[PDB]
Amino acid sequence: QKVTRLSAPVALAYREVSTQPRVSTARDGITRSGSELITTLKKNTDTEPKYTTAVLNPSEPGTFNQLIKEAAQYEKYRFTSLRFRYSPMSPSTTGGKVALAFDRDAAKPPPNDLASLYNIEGCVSSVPWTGFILTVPTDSTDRFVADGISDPKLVDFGKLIMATYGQGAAQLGEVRVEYTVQLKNRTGSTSAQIGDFAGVKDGPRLVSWSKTKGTAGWEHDCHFLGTGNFSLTLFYEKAPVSGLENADASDFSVLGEAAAGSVQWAGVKVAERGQGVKMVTTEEQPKGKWQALRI
Amino acid sequence: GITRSGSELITTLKKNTDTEPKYTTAVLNPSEPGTFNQLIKEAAQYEKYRFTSLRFRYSPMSPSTTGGKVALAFDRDAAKPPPNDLASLYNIEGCVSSVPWTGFILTVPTDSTDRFVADGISDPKLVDFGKLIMATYGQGAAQLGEVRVEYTVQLKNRTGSTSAQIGDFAGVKDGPRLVSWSKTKGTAGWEHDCHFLGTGNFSLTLFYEKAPVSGLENADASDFSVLGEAAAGSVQWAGVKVAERGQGVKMVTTEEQPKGKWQALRI
Amino acid sequence: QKVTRLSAPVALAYREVSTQPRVSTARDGITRSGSELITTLKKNTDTEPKYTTAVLNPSEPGTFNQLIKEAAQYEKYRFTSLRFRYSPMSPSTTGGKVALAFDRDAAKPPPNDLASLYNIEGCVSSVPWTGFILTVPTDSTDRFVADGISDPKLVDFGKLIMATYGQGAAQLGEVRVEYTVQLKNRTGSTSAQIGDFAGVKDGPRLVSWSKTKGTAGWEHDCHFLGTGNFSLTLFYEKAPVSGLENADASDFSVLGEAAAGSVQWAGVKVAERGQGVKMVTTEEQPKGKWQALRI
Amino acid sequence: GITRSGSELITTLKKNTDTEPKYTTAVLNPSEPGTFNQLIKEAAQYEKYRFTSLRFRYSPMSPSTTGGKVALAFDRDAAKPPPNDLASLYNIEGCVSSVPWTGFILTVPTDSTDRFVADGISDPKLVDFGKLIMATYGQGAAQLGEVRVEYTVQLKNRTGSTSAQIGDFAGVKDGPRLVSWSKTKGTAGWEHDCHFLGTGNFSLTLFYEKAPVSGLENADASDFSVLGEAAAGSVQWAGVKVAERGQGVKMVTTEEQPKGKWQALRI
Amino acid sequence: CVSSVPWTGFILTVPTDSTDRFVADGISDPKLVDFGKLIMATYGQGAAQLGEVRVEYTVQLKNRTGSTSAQIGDFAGVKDGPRLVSWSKTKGTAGWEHDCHFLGTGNFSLTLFYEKAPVSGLENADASDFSVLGEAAAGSVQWAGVKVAERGQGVKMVTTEEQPKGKWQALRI
Amino acid sequence: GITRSGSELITTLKKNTDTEPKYTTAVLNPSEPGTFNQLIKEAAQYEKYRFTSLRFRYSPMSPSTTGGKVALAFDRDAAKPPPNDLASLYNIEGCVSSVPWTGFILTVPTDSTDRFVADGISDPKLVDFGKLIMATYGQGAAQLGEVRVEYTVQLKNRTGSTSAQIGDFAGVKDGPRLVSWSKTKGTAGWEHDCHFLGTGNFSLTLFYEKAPVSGLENADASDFSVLGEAAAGSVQWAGVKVAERGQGVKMVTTEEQPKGKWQALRI
């Protein structure tokens, strides 16, 4: 029965705990179950949404900081369960919407506009003073994770999205990812990821998430192939131009010099796949070194 | 053996109108005042314990017109960097944060090994379970709430002793030469240092001569009680209630070390 | 089940009535049951509580204005039931705490500090937008009421306490005392209480609650031995120095001259046992008269 | 409720090479340090007790080449003049004195009523059983022995609080307004007073300005430690080890009360 | 107990206990954190590349935590930085000659550190196999594979006098 | 597992004709000779133990014409400063001091955890229960008595190994590279250092070249036996009988370290 009576309380709120994990034989596979909390959102007291599109793949920390530690021993997966809840922790004296719907094709520009968003399944935004959930029709093909690069389409379903458009004031809420995975084929390896340039050449030769291109006129390139919040840490020698700037990026944290021989660090929070950050040092490629951990 | 039961109120929290939590991780051991100001006075006669009951409640004393979260979950391994990030936090049992306009509780699976308290130092792992944590991330405005520690302890083996304590500075040097609980460092640009090595509620009492700058201020501290001048030659007093180990308090007097004297009793 | 869902309403409130009383044979005793409303509290938009500690004894009006009228015929009691509720009559748009826990040893300084408070049973403070109760393990010894003075320990359990620390704005709530007493031994007598000084000496010779000492350098003393809100009324002749001043006191109401031969009045609201008030008239003791009713 | 067990060593005795005993009567209550320096630290959180076990032994550490007696028997009514005379003593249970070259014990029929400790004053009878006693009459030479109190207590009702400590004089008046153990009276003809209300070894530390007469002298006292000037504007310190309740120490500075400040921590 | 000849197939087993011991997100003490190291000797003269072994096991990993890496540990001219999971402690012995250590045991993959490529680098002493494919560097890059022996075996550089440098990361493997 | 039973005589005490005790605190672990000179020879083949029986008796071998006390009580937490003061001592179980003219015993509640001995270092808490203590305060004259350790051990897990011993200095450096019991430090202003890490009676034998300053002197030591030159190129020998762990002996030869060689056998 909807009808009559409704209590839109001043305040509503939920109480979520701390998911402790569960697992299976050999047959030719292992498994999992969710419990992650994928970044939030932040007001929007504006008239056009604004998205944080976050990418989904067994290893893309910006979407799994606790499970990207058991895919360094396998390669391929599943999904059987996975949903995102807008926990709800902010009174009703605040409002708007909090779009939230996934698109298999986890990579492509979010639109720019709503209708655009409000036309791509997922479905389900609601107001910020309530508790909603989100679910996804998961398939059944033995897909591979990225010990790189590839193509953002043959290796992972598609990124997630989230927008929220409002103006009444607050720090809306939070979400995670309800899931259960299948990690076939026994492998084992990986890291940063550490990737050095040798005056003649480079070196990404130990698990990816970014490709480092440069655009001539030295101004350079510092990229991604994966999606989530990260912990950079790295590289150095002739601390030139700059460093660690960013452009199609999420939050940046640099606690370095410049360096002309120094050290550096940053935390990204990306958007949809492939967002970029860059230095500035001369003309033609040799440098120093770096390591990019997902987190 | 003897026993106990909780009733402490371990420091609060303070807004966070920001998008990344921020933690006060407080350490747990029969003697770490920064987590027991009323029971760190009956472990100076024993050495080893229990726990059979202990939970932390977010008392709830702040309207709903305020919101966010107030993470709060313990990790046996009471020592190691909190992360930096949530998920990180939101992946370590404890579990349980809720909003600030409600009343929540927290509980911990307690073991059963005859562990020893710290008449020091040691190693932060073989002497105490692990520290507690608490974060809160929000932006709507308030002074959230408060918590304590529901518990019941076991203090075997009859011992007896401890302190920090009278420790004087002699113009050339100092003098801590009669049982500790605090180390007195200074940070140049005289602004100074007045510290702890122990944990519980205390009764300060002390020190003096050129009553300068200030005195008895405090920072990573529990309740303060100063009933002094300043003094430029006076007398002073305070009661701490600490948090986890090593919380600090300080004076302010010049430039380069000589002064007067002090004595720090535990209580 | 705690979990999921919670409604911290804008407003919550209760509806209490008007306790009409109930009573037993001879055996060697009578009985009772509560219904009193012991003083409130008042904001505290500050960071340190602040207490109204109120004393408990069959006759201490500042804790019984309707039962201190049937202990003028007995001497000794019981308690079998007694609890204090924070009625709850103030919306949630307000908050903080309202400590409220009794300590047998009904007399001794409240602390100064919380932890101090938050370490003494009672237990139970909650926020001001809710309805809480409080209860006390009552004993079983034939204790005597005060047709005075005594010692605050052998005559009454201990005072009650109440603090509240907050800053969001309101006139919190109210409480009483759920109880059931035992008044053995048939006696009968009392009043003020009226206590006159005769130029050579005084006169407290008709039921107490205060002891009148003076501190030389005439500045004087006007005291308590009991606890609750009172109605003073009294004394006079050479309206000197002052009169009716107060120090470790609760609310004061003076509607007198000074008097140099006048009349006076005040209402106290004490704190824990023994709070003091005073006059000011010369040097060495003779005066006039007074009467102190509990209320 | 909680509980305990003894281990204290309550003051000794000292020769008596005389023909009339001479008593040190020491009072018993969960909080009376002059009879508990290690347990008067866990009754600041409760109020009421028990006793189930408690006996005093004359440890025996002095050769037989010495002799006399060492009376030692408790009297519920822990307060009233000791007599003056033996028979008087030798008529009040307890019973049991023996010679100083042997090892004796003493025991007490303990009751069973929920009695309250003193967050004061009261009446010495409704709050504590009664004081203990000890005499010794002899003449052959020695520093007899020592004793303690074998016990096991019950501390009901959860409370929590107390103290005595920083206490300043303001030219017009003073200031003890933050937990006691001593009362500072003066006896005219300025010669002064520096006292106790509590019992145990302490760490003084304090007070100052016109460093007169003296300072820190002592009389019905235990060990003294002064590491000050005099001061005429200085700083000072001492460690007491008292005897039974209320032992006194004093300064010497003029005529009529204003001074400086001090703080007395128990330890 | 149990050595045998190299032309046969033997096994080895260990009485395992039952106490909730902690792994090393460092350092500690090699005794309260792990049972004890294993051993293996072989004494012969007739010629061959004997055989191989593993570790038959079944573990219990309580308490849900989560974190770690190298392990990456940088020195900041004023101070250092091991602040992300250990296996070695880097002390120096004055007269600069230095220290490059372990707190853990197994074959590793070093990889790291740099700036003023001095003295040397990557030398080793109470060590297992070394693999350095660096300069020296006076600003370069380096690498090595250890195979240790029992706990705490050491390796070292050589660069001046008083501590500031560059950075490094030590992965276990 | 294997087992054992006591019979050791752990160092004595020596007068104290003074008013503050004074302690010899001796540490307990299957291998700490300063507490086992006959059983620290069968723990070089195992690692872990028990205790099921262990008590210390004050044998009593000194007339009553002497007196005082001989405190003697163990504290699990076998490591931490003894106090400084009695009450402090007289508050830590053990219990039991008596006079020197009598025969007393001491006993300890022993546990039941598979603890490990020290093929080092560690932490003094996770490897051994705690040290023992002994004080005696008196003034009447004598060489009080002696004690041992009544025990029965459990040495699980079959191991086997250990030592300290021959340790040479090579002009550039030294050489202890074949089992210890002593560490040889020097204190500048050449006056030097010749030490222990183990406890029991030993047979030194050793070292040489420029027979300088002296040699084989001793300080916190037990009996010395030197049957050498000086040597300026000679040979030497001594028998120690130590006290508690780490007692020291020394030479005297110049300025800056190179010498000759030595070997220290335990015995």
Swiss-Prot record, chains A, C:
SUPFAM superfamilies reported in the protein's UniProt record: Positive stranded ssRNA viruses
Impact noted for substituting G276S: In strain: Infectious clone UK
Region (S domain, virion shell): 30-183
Recorded consequence of changing K287R: In strain: Infectious clone UK
One term under GO cellular component: T=3 icosahedral viral capsid
Electron transport listed as a keyword: no
Coiled coil: none
Co-factor: note: Binds Ca(2+). Ca(2+) probably promotes virus assembly and stabilize the virus particle.
BP GO terms, sorted: symbiont-mediated suppression of host innate immune response
Motif (GW motif): 217-218
One function term, GO molecular function aspect: structural molecule activity
Cofactor list: Ca(2+)
UniProt KW Transcription regulation keyword: no
Keywords carried by this UniProt record: Calcium, Capsid protein, Host-virus interaction, Inhibition of host innate immune response by virus, RNA-binding, Suppressor of RNA silencing, T=3 icosahedral capsid protein, Viral immunoevasion, Virion
Subcellular location: Virion
Subunit structure: Homodimer. Homomultimer. Interacts (via GW motifs) with Arabidopsis thaliana AGO1 and AGO4; these interactions inhibit RNA silencing ability of host AGOs. Interacts with host TIP.
Role played: Capsid protein self-assembles to form an icosahedral capsid with a T=3 symmetry, about 32-35 nm in diameter, and consisting of 180 capsid proteins. Also acts as a suppressor of RNA-mediated gene silencing known as post-transcriptional gene silencing (PTGS), a mechanism of plant viral defense that limits the accumulation of viral RNAs. May suppress other innate immunity by binding to host TIP protein, thereby preventing it to migrate in the nucleus where it could trigger an antiviral response.
Family: Belongs to the icosahedral plant coat protein family.
Descriptive protein name: Capsid protein
Organism whose genome encodes this protein: Turnip crinkle virus
Taxon lineage: Viruses, Riboviria, Orthornavirae, Kitrinoviricota, Tolucaviricetes
